[PDB]
Amino acid sequence: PQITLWKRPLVTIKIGGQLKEALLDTGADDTVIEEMSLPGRWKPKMIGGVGGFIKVRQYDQIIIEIAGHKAIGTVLVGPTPVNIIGRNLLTQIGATLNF
Amino acid sequence: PQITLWKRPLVTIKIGGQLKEALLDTGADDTVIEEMSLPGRWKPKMIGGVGGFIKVRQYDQIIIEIAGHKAIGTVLVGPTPVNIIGRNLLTQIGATLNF
Numbered sequence: 080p081q082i083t084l085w086k087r088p089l090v091t092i093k094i095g096g097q098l099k100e101a102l103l104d105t106g107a108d109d110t111v112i113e114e115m116s117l118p119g120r121w122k123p124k125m126i127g128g129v130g131g132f133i134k135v136r137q138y139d140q141i142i143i144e145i146a147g148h149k150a151i152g153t154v155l156v157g158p159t160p161v162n163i164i165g166r167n168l169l170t171q172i173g174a175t176l177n178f
Numbered sequence: 179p180q181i182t183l184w185k186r187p188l189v190t191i192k193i194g195g196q197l198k199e200a201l202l203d204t205g206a207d208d209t210v211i212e213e214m215s216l217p218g219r220w221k222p223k224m225i226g227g228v229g230g231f232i233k234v235r236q237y238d239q240i241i242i243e244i245a246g247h248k249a250i251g252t253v254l255v256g257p258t259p260v261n262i263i264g265r266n267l268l269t270q271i272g273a274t275l276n277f
């Protein structure tokens with residue numbers, strides 16, 4: 080799809096058997112999801128942006144379906160105000176910025 | 179151009195006659211730049227990100243070039259970790275996300 084930017088670029092995702100809404104964020108290195116369960120081992124991480132840092136749990140090799148397109152990668156889980164799809168998964172679905 | 183996301187989508191901007199680096203950020207409503215001097219009066223604004231909220235100065239109708247494309251619009255100045263070009267100006271330069 081071609082997504083214009085008049086509004087926030089929100090899409091439906093499926094992760095860990097759950098549907099969620101998430102923001103496509105070219106300004107995010109990583110993908111960050113609100114508290115949920117995921118399989119496998121994790122390690123803590125601190126991630127920062129506007130307003131400072133939050134502590135998250137890093138899970139690897141997680142499959143997400145993003146607007147119908149499957150991707151695998153690292154997902155961070157923690158108290159983010161918005162679910163964010165970052166570059167690590169945007170690349171996998173072939174997303175580009177065009178102007 | 180077509181900008182892939184394997185690296186951060188950093189571009190050169192020009193504001194106040196000066197060249198700066200900024201991040202093209204589809205997950206940002208607004209454009210936020212590190213402390214600098216801009217002309218005119220400002221109004222107060224609170225913005226939020228992954229770590230919480232910060233106060234910024236809002237300047238309107240500022241002339242800015244983004245990757246060689248001319249825009250005129252609102253620029254927020256404050257303690258952002260990085261210069262970000264948000265949707266308010268991405269729409270002026272005709273940017274879309276595509277996959």
Ligand SMILES: CCCC[C@@H](CN[C@@H](CCCC)C(=O)N[C@@H](CCC(N)=O)C(=O)N[C@@H](CCCNC(N)=[NH2+])C(N)=O)NC(=O)[C@@H](NC(=O)[C@@H](NC(C)=O)[C@@H](C)O)[C@@H](C)CC
Nearest residue numbers: 106107108109127128161205206207208225226227228259
């Ligand atoms: C400044 C740092 C770079 C840009 C920023 C853009 N992220 C979005 C996420 C939105 C969810 C919180 C953002 O902050 N957007 C703000 C930007 C400010 C602005 N005004 O445009 C926004 O639109 N804020 C809206 C509110 C969004 C609320 N939405 C909602 N409640 N549904 C606003 N009007 O204040 N990226 C990040 O915050 C990411 N940071 C990074 O990628 C890097 N960190 C740093 C410091 O560069 C990396 C080294 O960790 C996070 C997510 C970790 C991977």
